[PDB]
Amino acid sequence: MEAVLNELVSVEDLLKFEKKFQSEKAAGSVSKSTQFEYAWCLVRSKYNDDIRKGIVLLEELLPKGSKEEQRDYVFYLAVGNYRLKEYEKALKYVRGLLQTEPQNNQAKELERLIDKAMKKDGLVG
Amino acid sequence: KHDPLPYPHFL
Numbered sequence: 702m703e704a705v706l707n708e709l710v711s712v713e714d715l716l717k718f719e720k721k722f723q724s725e726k727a728a729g730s731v732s733k734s735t736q737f738e739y740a741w742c743l744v745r746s747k748y749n750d751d752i753r754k755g756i757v758l759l760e761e762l763l764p765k766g767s768k769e770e771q772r773d774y775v776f777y778l779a780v781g782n783y784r785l786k787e788y789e790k791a792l793k794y795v796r797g798l799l800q801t802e803p804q805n806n807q808a809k810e811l812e813r814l815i816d817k818a819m820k821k822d823g824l825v826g
Numbered sequence: 827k828h829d830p831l832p833y834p835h836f837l
Contacts, residue, residue, distance in 0.1 A: 705835050745833055752830055780837070784830040810836055818831060 709745040718742050736762055737774070744781040756781045772798060776808065783815050789826055791815050 718739040725731040736758050743755025759778050766774055775794050782791035792815055798808045819826060 703835070709833055747830070749830055780834060784833065786831065807836065811834055814834055
């Protein structure tokens with residue numbers, strides 16, 4: 702149902718969401734949607750420092766979310782950590798999601814990708 | 827260390 706793109710977010714879109722984030726942060730109150738949307742762009746970036754910034758923003762969002770939103774935040778924290786080969790963190794997040802949502806086919810596939818990436822690197826966990 | 831792993835394709 703999809704094609705494999707290499708550039709998942711343009712520099713212009715990353716900057717648009719960065720600008721709104723920094724506007725709100727300087728004005729004192731940041732919308733959850735503004736912070737999440739920026740983080741969501743960051744975690745799709747090609748660059749490691751972007752993905753790390755997105756993980757930071759998602760961890761800050763976690764205590765502000767409804768239980769449904771927290772599940773989405775934890776999923777994207779698993780994705781970002783996976784891409785950075787922060788395997789222990791990626792497993793912690795996705796396995797926590799899989800006990801609170803054992804039917805989640807997306808979480809199960811992400812766990813399989815993490816497992817394969819760890820075995821490729823010769824690691825256990 | 828260098829490039830991030832690809833964003834998971836099923837997304």
